Amino acid sequence: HMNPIVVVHGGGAGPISKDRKERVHQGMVRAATVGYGILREGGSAVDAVEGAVVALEDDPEFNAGCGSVLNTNGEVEMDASIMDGKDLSAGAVSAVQCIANPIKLARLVMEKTPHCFLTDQGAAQFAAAMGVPEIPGEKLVTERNKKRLEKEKHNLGTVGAVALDCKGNVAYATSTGGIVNKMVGRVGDSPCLGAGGYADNDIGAVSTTGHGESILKVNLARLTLFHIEQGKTVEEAADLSLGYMKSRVKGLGGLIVVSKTGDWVAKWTSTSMPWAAAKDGKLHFGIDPDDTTITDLP
Amino acid sequence: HMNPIVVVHGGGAGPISKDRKERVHQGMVRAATVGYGILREGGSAVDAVEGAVVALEDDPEFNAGCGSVLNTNGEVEMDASIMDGKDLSAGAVSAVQCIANPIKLARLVMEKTPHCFLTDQGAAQFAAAMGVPEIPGEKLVTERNKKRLEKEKHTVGAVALDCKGNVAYATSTGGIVNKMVGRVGDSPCLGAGGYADNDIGAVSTTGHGESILKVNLARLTLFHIEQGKTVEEAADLSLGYMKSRVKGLGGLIVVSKTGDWVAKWTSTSMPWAAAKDGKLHFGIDPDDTTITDLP
Ligand SMILES: N[C@@H](CC(=O)O)C(=O)O
Ligand SMILES: N[C@@H](CC(=O)O)C(=O)O
Numbered sequence: 001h002m003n004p005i006v007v008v009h010g011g012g013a014g015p016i017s018k019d020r021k022e023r024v025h026q027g028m029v030r031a032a033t034v035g036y037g038i039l040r041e042g043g044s045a046v047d048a049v050e051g052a053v054v055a056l057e058d059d060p061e062f063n064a065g066c067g068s069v070l071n072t073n074g075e076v077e078m079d080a081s082i083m084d085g086k087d088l089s090a091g092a093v094s095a096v097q098c099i100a101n102p103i104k105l106a107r108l109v110m111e112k113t114p115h116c117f118l119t120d121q122g123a124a125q126f127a128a129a130m131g132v133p134e135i136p137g138e139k140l141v142t143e144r145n146k147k148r149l150e151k152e153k154h155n156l157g158t159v160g161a162v163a164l165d166c167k168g169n170v171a172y173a174t175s176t177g178g179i180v181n182k183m184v185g186r187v188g189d190s191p192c193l194g195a196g197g198y199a200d201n202d203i204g205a206v207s208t209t210g211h212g213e214s215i216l217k218v219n220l221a222r223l224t225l226f227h228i229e230q231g232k233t234v235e236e237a238a239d240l241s242l243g244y245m246k247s248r249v250k251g252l253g254g255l256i257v258v259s260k261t262g263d264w265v266a267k268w269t270s271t272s273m274p275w276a277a278a279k280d281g282k283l284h285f286g287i288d289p290d291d292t293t294i295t296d297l298p
Numbered sequence: 299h300m301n302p303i304v305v306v307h308g309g310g311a312g313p314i315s316k317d318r319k320e321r322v323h324q325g326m327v328r329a330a331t332v333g334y335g336i337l338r339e340g341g342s343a344v345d346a347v348e349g350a351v352v353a354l355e356d357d358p359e360f361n362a363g364c365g366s367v368l369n370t371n372g373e374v375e376m377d378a379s380i381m382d383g384k385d386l387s388a389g390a391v392s393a394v395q396c397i398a399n400p401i402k403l404a405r406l407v408m409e410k411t412p413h414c415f416l417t418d419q420g421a422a423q424f425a426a427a428m429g430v431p432e433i434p435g436e437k438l439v440t441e442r443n444k445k446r447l448e449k450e451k452h453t454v455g456a457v458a459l460d461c462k463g464n465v466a467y468a469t470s471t472g473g474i475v476n477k478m479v480g481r482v483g484d485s486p487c488l489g490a491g492g493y494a495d496n497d498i499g500a501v502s503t504t505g506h507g508e509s510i511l512k513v514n515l516a517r518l519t520l521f522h523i524e525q526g527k528t529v530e531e532a533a534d535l536s537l538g539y540m541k542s543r544v545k546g547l548g549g550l551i552v553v554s555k556t557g558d559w560v561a562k563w564t565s566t567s568m569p570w571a572a573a574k575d576g577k578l579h580f581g582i583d584p585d586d587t588t589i590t591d592l593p
């Protein structure tokens with residue numbers, strides 16, 4: 001039975017200040033720790049990836065859940081998707097408001113409906129039916145995001161996870177507030193299977209980040225898995241898939257991947273991509289190209 | 299330059315009633331002749347698929363625009379997408395209400411916004427701002443659809459190659475009878491309900507929405523074409539995979555950048571039509587095709 005692995009990412013963005021960098025570090029380490037804590041007890045890849053993304057959704061330092069960027073009208077609208085590589089089971093929500101954890105809604109769509117993808121008013125009503133708390137919007141809004149919007153008028157922090165569990169299952173989760181000053185009802189790549197992520201026990205799992213429009217246009221996550229299918233290593237596949245997005249549609253971004261055999265990488269063409277990985281009782285972490293450290297998990 | 303082509307589909311289906319077959323036939327003909335006409339004016343592949351789908355939206359016989367199936371509240375909520383194979387520009391809308399032509403709004407998303415996908419209330423606000431008429435919800439609802447929903451409470455597309463070698467797809471749907479409010483299927487999702495890439499070809503799909511999403515059917519098909527499969531082989535592998543992996547049935551239409559095309563399906567039926575070299579090809583049931591001249 002396989003050694004479990006989890007990889008998590010923040011946002012495929014530009015330069016990050018020294019200060020934000022350490023806050024970003026704590027939250028990523030926390031999310032890797034939650035996800036690996038799940039796998040180390042015999043939990044499922046789905047459970048682990050959900051666990052990690054919840055930790056980042058809850059953390060204000062990240063563009064998902066609380067700390068989501070604001071749309072054009074100063075409101076938080078969130079997307080999330082989750083997928084189980086065994087049966088290709090999947091759930092997703094887009095343009096969801098007034099809930100703490102869109103990824104958990106995505107999960108309820110997967111397991112509690114005959115559908116994969118709920119949007120807006122319908123996602124709100126389903127959440128209500130499943131007892132998910134409706135919270136005031138200002139709880140998701142942060143001062144940092146008010147400032148970013150107000151300025152943009154006169155990208156960063158998006159979150160995701162992939163895992164391989166001891167039973168040989170793979171999974172991904174992705175969740176976002178989108179891009180600042182997006183139009184009302186703009187859907188990005190995060191809830192769209194094949195773009196925001198893809199997971200398949202017979203290949204591996206991918207979660208992506210960056211310019212969502214570009215990601216959707218190339219189907220970045222499933223494209224990366226295509227390269228793995230052809231026999232490329234995980235790094236070669238990421239290089240080639242991100243390479244193609246840059247050439248064809250001029251978009252930058254980043255991805256994490258874990259293969260069916262436990263190989264894994266984080267790769268980006270943006271300036272930075274916060275990422276953490278947990279395997280063999282060791283924690284791997286970076287933000288910039290080869291600033292990587294390895295540290296012991298308790 | 300290339301000989302242009304348009305292929306249209308009117309949705310994977312169980313067995314279709316005899317009387318219905320005639321009106322479906324006529325609908326398929328009107329859409330394909332509309333698409334091909336635009337191509338004959340030397341129009342673009344995107345113009346061609348848009349017009350082809352617009353006709354089917356307006357035709358109450360087909361599950362898109364007027365004549366869309368009804369969700370669990372007896373209402374019409376529509377999904378559409380369109381893709382330009384040249385640079386992979388795209389536009390999509392999901393869960394839109396009270397407009398005649400979701401495919402036209404998907405094209406506005408592609409052309410007038412920095413985005414690729416708008417949904418529900420955002421899409422409605424964008425529609426108003428583009429000056430799209432708000433049409434009564436009841437005007438999209440047909441009697442047979444009201445009666446389809448009662449029986450449960452007790453999809454169209456096009457691909458084209460143009461005269462400069464550019465490909466496109468468009469797909470529009472009302473979704474599935476009795477669907478949860480705000481359910482979004484494969485139709486508006488790039489790579490699932492369709493894909494277009496000048497380096498390969500273009501696909502539009504139909505069938506079980508969730509299954510088509512899970513296997514990313516449009517993109518999967520093109521992957522096979524990249525690998526050297528004929529369009530027919532590619533369509534059979536991808537549909538075969540959907541069936542064996544997720545127990546989903548459906549159909550698809552595909553045109554390559556060479557101008558080879560095919561309509562295949564694992565559902566019982568799929569109305570389809572294709573126009574190329576002054577001739578019109580039409581079918582609903584497998585091993586049963588009719589070829590007429592096209593003025
Ligand atoms: N992919 C996200 C943004 C990001 O990952 O930075 C979106 O477009 O919604
Ligand atoms: N694919 C459509 C259904 C159909 O093709 O008829 C949907 O589920 O939204």
Ligand code: NA
Pocket residue numbers: 056057058059060061062063064065066067068
């Ligand atoms: Na957050």
Ligand code: NA
Pocket residue numbers: 354355356357358359360361362363364365366
């Ligand atoms: Na119609």
